[PDB]
């Protein structure tokens, strides 16, 4: 509102409009530009906003002003456009600022949704897709909101990726599709023990490490890794660490006996154990782990 | 605002209005229905909003769209109402969606207030009441609330 000798904001409507797939592909990734117009569905209505209330033009994306400890960002307009003064009138002014932001995205088990660093929730699996059974991953959105492009070459504002592009009511989020099983794991490697002594007593195995002062207690029967849900890291991490530790301390004096064996210790610890031998002698579930190793250290000391 | 070939939102005023005690007793708990109007005190003013800017009607509460790891909810409308096109005019449209949500509530010692799963604080003891000395529990609100 333009009063006499002063102007006052009667209101400021603020909204986040997603950039459609078509613009992301043909404008932003192709030329590093956005449209000055925002056409999008809000409150069950197709709404169109023109930057400065002017005709639609292509606007260059330029780096955002640097802020410490923030990711890369780009935008098209730096100033808010307000209507020119006409006395004793309510006037309206539109600003459209196309913003592209690299962000970190985080997902917790069972990975049916993820978050962005901006605090926004995406109610889709990060591993949702069309290939290798990824279409059975969780999606909350309609089919038209999700796009997957094979052979996608990103252009910085060499190697192609499979690009997931999901249009939410507020934004479009794009990332690289990867198969779920090689990516996530319900267990993580904690300790590498180059000298772990196994003793059989009382129907139990005791795995003692002098280096970390720890005695784990397992049953005699092995733990089959098929009982672990999404536990594909365990075998691969176990084999590389075991062979690396072997090819560094026993490659000359010891031989491996058999293949690595798996055991579940009290406290919820998964032990991958390669037995050695001296030359002179020669429904899937999630394992719960306690936060305190002190019981096993007391066991070792005692 | 309705341009020649496009429609643009000039503004979207969003508000949460409480459902009065009498409507909870007489409509929601008695019949599973809500009034299409919201009459409530906001900014020291009694404001009345009519759904679709239409006459008051009783509207049935229906289960909300299911979401994983989410408690039970009910509502009356899933579409926002916007004014029909009249070229070169600013027009207004009112949507009233009566929402009932079962929620978890949590309270820490000394239990003079509690929170809801929506992040809303309630500045009153969960154990506030009229009986067994519970009227001495903390309340921040007026008696009529």
């Amino acid at each position: 509102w333009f009063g006499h000798r002063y102007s006052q904001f009667m209101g400021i409507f603020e909204d986040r409009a997603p950039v459609p797939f078509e613009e992301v592909i043909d404008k932003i990734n192709a030329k590093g530009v956005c449209r000055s117009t925002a056409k999008y569905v809000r409150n069950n209505m197709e709404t169109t906003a023109f930057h400065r209330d002017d005709h639609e033009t292509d606007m260059e994306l330029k780096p955002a002003k640097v802020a410490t400890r923030t990711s890369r960002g780009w935008h098209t307009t730096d100033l808010k456009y307000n209507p020119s003064r006409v006395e004793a009138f309510h006037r309206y002014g539109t600003t459209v600022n196309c913003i592209v932001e690299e962000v970190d995205a985080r997902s917790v088990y069972p990975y049916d949704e993820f978050v962005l660093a901006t605090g926004d929730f995406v109610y889709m699996s990060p591993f949702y897709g069309y290939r290798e059974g990824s279409h059975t991953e969780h999606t909350s959105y309609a089919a038209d909101r999700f796009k997957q492009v094979d052979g996608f070459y990103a252009r910085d504002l060499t190697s192609p990726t499979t690009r997931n592009l999901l249009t939410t009511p507020k934004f479009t989020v794009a990332w690289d599709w990867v198969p779920k099983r090689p990516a996530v794991c319900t267990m993580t490697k904690w300790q590498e023990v180059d000298e772990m002594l196994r003793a059989e007593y009382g129907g139990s195995f005791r795995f003692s490490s002098d280096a970390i002062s720890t005695t784990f207690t397992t049953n005699l029967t092995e733990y089959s890794l098929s009982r672990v849900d999404l536990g594909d890291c365990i075998g691969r991490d176990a084999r590389e660490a075991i062979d690396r530790m072997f090819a560094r301390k026993y490659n000359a004096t010891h031989i491996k006996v058999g293949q690595p064996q798996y055991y579940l210790a009290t406290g919820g610890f998964l032990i991958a154990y390669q037995p050695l031998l001296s030359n002179t002698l020669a429904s899937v579930e999630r394992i719960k782990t306690t936060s305190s190793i002190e019981f096993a250290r007391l066991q070792f000391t005692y | 605002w309705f341009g020649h070939r496009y429609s643009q939102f000039m503004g979207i005023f969003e508000d949460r209005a409480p459902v009065p005690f009498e409507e909870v007793i007489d409509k929601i708990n008695a019949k599973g229905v809500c009034r299409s109007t919201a009459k409530y005190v906001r900014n020291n003013m009694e404001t009345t909003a009519f759904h679709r800017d239409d006459h008051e009607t009783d509207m049935e509460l229906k289960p909300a769209k299911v979401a994983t790891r989410t408690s039970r909810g009910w509502h009356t409308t899933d579409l926002k109402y916007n004014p029909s096109r009249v070229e070169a005019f600013h027009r207004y449209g009112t949507t009233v969606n009566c929402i009932v949500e079962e929620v978890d509530a949590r309270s820490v010692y000394p239990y003079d207030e509690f929170v809801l799963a929506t992040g809303d604080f309630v500045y009153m003891s969960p154990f506030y009441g009229y009986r067994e000395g519970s009227h001495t529990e903390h309340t921040s609100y007026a008696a009529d609330r």
């Binding site: 569905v41 605090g119 929730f121 109610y123 309609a142 038209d144 009511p169 | 909300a64 509502h75 579409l79």
Partner: peptide, 21 residues
């Protein structure tokens, strides 16, 4: 709280329907 609150339109609203006039 955020995960609950940002499901509001998916639960109580319609984000895909576009009404003309």
């Amino acid at each position: 709280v955020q995960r609950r609150n940002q499901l509001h339109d998916l639960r109580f609203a319609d984000i895909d329907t576009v009404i003309r006039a």
